Amino acid sequence: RIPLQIVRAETELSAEEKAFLNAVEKGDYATVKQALQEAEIYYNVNINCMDPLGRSALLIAIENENLEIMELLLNHSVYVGDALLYAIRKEVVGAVELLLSYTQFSEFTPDITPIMLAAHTNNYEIIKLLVQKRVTIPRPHQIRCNCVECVSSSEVDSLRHSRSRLNIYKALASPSLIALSSEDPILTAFRLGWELKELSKVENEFKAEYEELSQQCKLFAKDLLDQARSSRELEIILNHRDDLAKLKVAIKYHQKEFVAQPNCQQLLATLWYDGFPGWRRKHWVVKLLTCMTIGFLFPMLSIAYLISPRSNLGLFIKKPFIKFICHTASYLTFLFMLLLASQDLHVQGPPPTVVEWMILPWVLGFIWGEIKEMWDGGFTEYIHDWWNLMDFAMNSLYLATISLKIVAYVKYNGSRPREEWEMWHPTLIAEALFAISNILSSLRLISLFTANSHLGPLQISLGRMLLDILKFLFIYCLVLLAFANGLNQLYFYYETRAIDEPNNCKGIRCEKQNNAFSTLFETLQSLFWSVFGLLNLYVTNVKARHEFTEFVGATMFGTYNVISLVVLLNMLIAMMNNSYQLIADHADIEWKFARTKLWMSYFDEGGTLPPPFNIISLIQNQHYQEVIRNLVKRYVAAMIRNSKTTEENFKELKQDISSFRYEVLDLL
């Protein structure tokens, strides 16, 4: 048997103290009033007594939404400490106003204040009631603040400090508290969400709560935008300056839902097709023919802009869709010339051919455009693209190609056959660099999948799965290096000279593979190519009759195969499946954000000419304020409607019925 008793005992209620609490719970006004009047004379009942759940009479009255009994208790001067917090959490309008007009256990932490709790509940009525007075919320310090107060509070009590900061940010991120008491709710939501995301990054713990607060602020901004009812209002909102200034601010703060708003996208599309008014309703063949015709005429449009920008053709290229088509056509012609560039080879450092002479201005235009973007946009914007890295690599490789071509031209004159050229001859290195540059240039077309409806979200999904690929890369590389070390340690004794080989060819790229694991570099390459099955098995064989050594090397190779293919590759497939399922829900919003960035990149005057042709306030604030007031009214009404459209509800219904019953019985 296990005896069961009360380990942590408390003070039990008296027989009367229990009858009085039961009367309060049942809502019988007459008996509660009689008990209150009798307590003043006889002092037999403690009006502040708790219950087995810790609730006093006032807390019971508040929880039952019994305003009459509550007010009766207040008129008898019962203990009221922290009752306002319970009234605010209960989200009952009557309790606050009643209570507003006037160390025990508490369900609320000491740092909770009435306005902070009201902001936590996100109840517009109670928040407005509290803001009607003079209430304040403490300002949180910097995310990486190092003042004496912050470090002192962190060292004295880290839990209390973290809880207080989280409560403050929960209060500030309240959509209702931003709807009121905020000059610019949209900008406030943007910057508050950004700061909450930064806190989520910094705070390893409480990361989920800061993430959800930031997401809540983002959704509040998106809903405020949703309340717009006319194009005039939407233009006023997006063009406000603290064109499309506020849209640019939203893009800066990574407000993807706000940018992907259907009305925002519709306005951006009307700006995107400046020239064509009816591009929305056209057939596939008509659109394709128009795109082909505009692309084939890109040199004409560029020349017209160069000569006279003010004409039917001079300013026709400044239109965003037309400019995009011209740049894409220019890049396509550049790639076509790159393909044609491989259609006498014994000359050491030959002069550039006609195709190379045509290619050169495109490379110069690419470099000039990159440096112009760096000079104009800035440094942080240039490095935030993450596509400028490939552009920088292409430009550097092209510059190295040109330098090596010049070196080979001015250092060699004779025509020696390539068979006897040096391994590190300048022409060979230049050609290798040019080939790598061609690969990168042709691969640069991936960034244009954003402009397409069918290819955009797919590109987003593949880009976000590249992160899982990168994560798997580390473990694969560790395994690869481990087995490379083992195989090299085992096999480096039997290294053979190239002369001994049947065709004077040494390594794994010969017709008969040999010396697969003789050196660490060759071992790494061999383990790489065994992933694709191009490494033959006999490479695990040695000329000496060391069958144990051969078997051990073969077993190492087989274990590497088993891991890298059976275990690691299937785990990679599983990770990709999970990540793609996770990111399939938000593909459209991310794609629309990326496409908005692409479209806005073509809104600027600078960079109008594609290569190689590039080398040749009070009233506005008042309008914004009135639009914001209308949006806030509409948002508040809509959210109240949505919330209107628990066991405590049934408890309140029972309380109302019982109070009515007791009143009727007393009257009769």
Ligand X SMILES: CCCCCCCCCCCCCCCCCCCC(=O)O[C@H](COC(=O)CCCCCCCCCCCCCC)COP(=O)(O)OCCN
Ligand Y SMILES: CCCCCCCC/C=C\CCCCCCCC(=O)O[C@@H](COC(=O)CCCCCCCCCCCCCCC)COP(=O)([O-])OCC[N+](C)(C)C
Which residues make up each annotated binding site for Zn(2+)?
141, 145, 147, 150
Q: Does 37 bind ligand Y01 (CB under 6 A)?
A: no
Contact 460, 593 (CB under 8 A): no
Three-class SS state of 350: coil
Let me know how many helices (H) and strands (E) the chain has, helices first. Answer: 31, 0
Q: How far is CA 265 from CA 217, 228, 523, in A?
A: 21, 14, 54
Q: Does 551 bind ligand GWR (CB under 6 A)?
A: yes
Binding segment for ligand Y (CB under 6 A), chosen from 69-77, 79-87, 230-238, 392-400, is 392-400
CB nearer ligand Y01, residue 271 or residue 451: 451
Contact 531, 565 (CB under 8 A): yes
Nearest to 85 by CA among 67, 58, 48: 58
Please list every residue from 405 through 444 that binds ligand Y, using CB under 6 A.
424, 426, 429, 436
The site partner of 446 among ligand Y01, ligand GWR, ligand X, none (C-beta below 5 to 8 Å per kind) is ligand X
Contact 398, 611 (CB under 8 A): no
Torsion of CA 39, 44, 50, 51, to 10 degrees: -110
Q: Does 205 bind a copy of itself (CB under 8 A)?
A: yes
Please list every residue from 375 through 404 that binds Ca ion, using CB under 5 A.
388, 391
CB of 642 vs a copy of itself, minimal distance in Å: 17
Of 505, 554, 575, 636, which one interacts with ligand GWR (CB under 6 A)?
Answer: 554
Three-class SS state of 385: coil
Please list every residue from 74 through 113 that binds a copy of itself, using CB under 8 A.
none
Of 34, 152, 270, 555, which one interacts with ligand GWR (CB under 6 A)?
Answer: 555
Residues belonging to the binding site for Ca(2+) are 370, 373, 388, 391
CB nearer ligand Y01, residue 321 or residue 491: 321
Q: How far is CA 452 from CA 272, 293, 447, 455, 602, in A?
A: 14, 19, 10, 5, 16
Nearest to 44 by CA among 77, 20, 24: 20
**b/e 11-36 (16+ beta carbons within 10 angstroms → b):** eebeebbeebbebbbbbbbebbbebb
CB of 374 vs ligand X, minimal distance in Å: 17
Q: Does 533 bind a copy of itself (CB under 8 A)?
A: yes
Of 34, 44, 75, 452, which one interacts with ligand Y01 (CB under 6 A)?
Answer: 452
Tell me the HSE value of 35 on the side-chain side, using a 13 A CA sphere.
24
Binding segment for ligand Y (CB under 6 A), chosen from 78-86, 393-401, 449-457, 580-588, is 393-401
CB of 545 vs ligand GWR, minimal distance in Å: 17
CB of 472 vs ligand GWR, minimal distance in Å: 21
Q: Does 439 bind ligand X (CB under 6 A)?
A: yes
Of 386, 424, 474, 548, which one interacts with ligand X (CB under 6 A)?
Answer: 386
Q: Does 158 bind ligand Y01 (CB under 6 A)?
A: no
Q: Does 562 bind ligand GWR (CB under 6 A)?
A: yes
Of 271, 364, 429, 448, which one interacts with ligand Y01 (CB under 6 A)?
Answer: 448
Q: Does 449 bind ligand Y01 (CB under 6 A)?
A: yes
Three-class SS state of 177: helix
CA pseudo-torsion sign 222, 228, 231, 232 = negative
Please list every residue from 403 through 462 that binds a copy of itself, using CB under 8 A.
453
The single residue listed with the structure tokens 């430009």 is 395
The single residue listed with the structure tokens 């040695």 is 542
Q: How far apart are CA 10 and CA 634, in angstroms?
A: 52
CB nearer ligand Y, residue 151 or residue 389: 389
Q: How far is CA 629 from CA 174, 233, 294, 625, 636, in A?
A: 17, 11, 45, 6, 11
Of 44, 132, 559, 625, which one interacts with ligand GWR (CB under 6 A)?
Answer: 559
Q: Give start and end residues of each alpha helix (H) in 492-567.
A: 520-531, 547-561
Q: Does 598 bind ligand X (CB under 6 A)?
A: no
Binding segment for ligand Y01 (CB under 6 A), chosen from 58-66, 212-220, 431-439, 444-452, is 444-452
Nearest to 391 by CA among 376, 371, 406: 371
| CB neighbour class for 487 (10 Å; exposed up to 12, middle 13-18, buried from 19) | buried
**Binding region for ligand X (CB under 6 A):** 386-387, 389-390, 393, 436, 439, 443, 446, 459, 462-463, 466
Binding site for a copy of itself (CB under 8 A): 4-8, 177, 180-183, 202-206, 262-263, 265-266, 269, 280-281, 453, 533, 577
Q: Which residues bind ligand Y01 (CB under 6 A)?
A: 321, 328, 332, 445, 448-449, 451-452
Q: Which residues bind ligand Y (CB under 6 A)?
A: 393, 396-397, 400, 424, 426, 429, 436
Residues at the contact surface with Zn ion, assessed by CB under 5 A: 141, 145, 147, 150
Which residues are at the interface with Ca ion (CB under 5 A)? 388, 391
